[PDB]
Amino acid sequence: LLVPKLTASVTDGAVGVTVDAPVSVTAADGVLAAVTMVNDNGRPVAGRLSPDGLRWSTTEQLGYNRRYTLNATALGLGGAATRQLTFQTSSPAHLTMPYVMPGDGEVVGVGEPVAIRFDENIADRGAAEKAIKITTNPPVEGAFYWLNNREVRWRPEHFWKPGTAVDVAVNTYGVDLGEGMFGEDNVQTHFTIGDEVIATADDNTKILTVRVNGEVVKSMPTSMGKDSTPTANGIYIVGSRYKHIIMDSSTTDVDWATQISYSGVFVHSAPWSVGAQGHTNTSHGCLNVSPSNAQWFYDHVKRGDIVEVVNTVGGTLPGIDGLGDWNIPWDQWRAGNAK
């Protein structure tokens, strides 16, 4: 009871040990002289001994399907103790890789959700949500909601406050995502919320008014979808932008095209309907504006800014569109759909 005591974060003979966490060893009544961990080819795992010699931990990722042997020696005024244990890590049936948006270091608008897309259908949505650590500053409540079996989103109840830093750590390596599916790797992203930019298209006036931090900076006459093919009402998140693109219904050479739905709504240059803009809806659902105004939008609106459509004869944009997240009421969004 006077020689050093050694503890570890893993148990001898354990199987299915998950590789999401480092392995640690601690000494009491003594100091660790040396600690090694090797795989079944005798290859060491990197680790670090604290300055005080009381704690050691691994410092790189352990692999799947591996047996590791831990050897530790501790010394203290009461003598020495050397101890050994072996354990075996998870053996996945399959791996899945995550992909996070928005991109790292980006500045985005006040509508931009955090988006985590997997390359496999996730059986245990709750395990995936628990593995995704989102930090906000200033802190704000948000919640997860799945758009489909492969992609989860996170957002606050209200649009983001400009100046908010968002850090996203997708810690899916070594996590069991159900049905033997484990995370292939971790991913991260950090981004910032820029200025509040909200462009409202009112079908009663046929004007698209862009407001930055609440104040009108641009009015644009528009022509939206004709009655046969109306523009849906609702809140749309700004996506990608293209200088020139081939707009095709099977999914008209079009310039200055800013996408606002996965369903194919764009704000774009429509020289052919300039006389109708401000008066008569004429498109297939796109917000047609002048070549000039389209380029203004392309230049001054960024991913994550908002377009709100109101008072059209259409219905509402679906909340699971891809860019329609805000159309899901908060009680529904927050309750989530993990089960």
Look at the domain 91-194+325-339 and name its fold: Immunoglobulin-like (2.60.40)
> Is 264 marked within a binding site?
yes
CA distance 117 to 315: 28
> Is 203 marked within a binding site?
no
> Is 180 marked within a binding site?
yes
CA distance 111 to 53: 49
Note every long-range contact of 249-258, with CB atoms under 8 Å and residues 24 or more positions apart, other chains counting: 249/284, 255/291, 255/294, 255/295, 256/291, 256/294, 256/295, 256/297, 256/298, 257/294, 257/298, 258/294, 258/297, 258/298, 258/301
Resolution (A): 1.6
Q: How far is CA 40 from the centre of its chain?
A: 37
CA distance 164 to 139: 8
Handedness of CA 253, 259, 261, 265 (dihedral sign): negative
Of 317, 320, 322, 319, nearest to 233 by C-alpha is 317
Q: Residues 9, 10, 14, CA angle at the centre, nearest 5°?
A: 165
Give me 289's structure tokens. Answer: 């504006």
CA distance 251 to 310: 26
Strands 287-289, 266-269: pairing kind: parallel
> 110, 305 in Cβ contact below 8 A?
yes
> CA dihedral defined by 255, 258, 260, 263, rounded to 10 degrees?
30
CB atoms near residue 291 (< 10 Å): 14
Residue with tokens 């764009």: 266
3-state SS assignment for residue 208: strand
Handedness of CA 124, 130, 133, 135 (dihedral sign): positive
Strands 107-108, 187-193: pairing kind: parallel
Q: How far is CA 289 from the centre of its chain?
A: 32
Helix (H) or strand (E) holding 130: helix 125-131
> 156, 304 in Cβ contact below 8 A?
no
Q: In 3-state terms, the chain is what percent helix, strand and coil (to 5)?
A: 10, 45, 45
Domain boundaries, the chain: 1-90, 91-194+325-339, 195-324
> Is 204 marked within a binding site?
no
Of 78, 69, 76, 84, nearest to 33 by C-alpha is 76
Look at the domain 195-324 and name its fold: L,D-transpeptidase catalytic domain-like (2.40.440)
In degrees and rounded to multiples of 5, residue 98 shows phi and psi of -95, 155
> Is 179 marked within a binding site?
yes
CA distance 336 to 339: 8
Residue with tokens 């009402």: 233
Q: Catalytic residue numbers?
A: 268, 286
3-state SS assignment for residue 183: strand
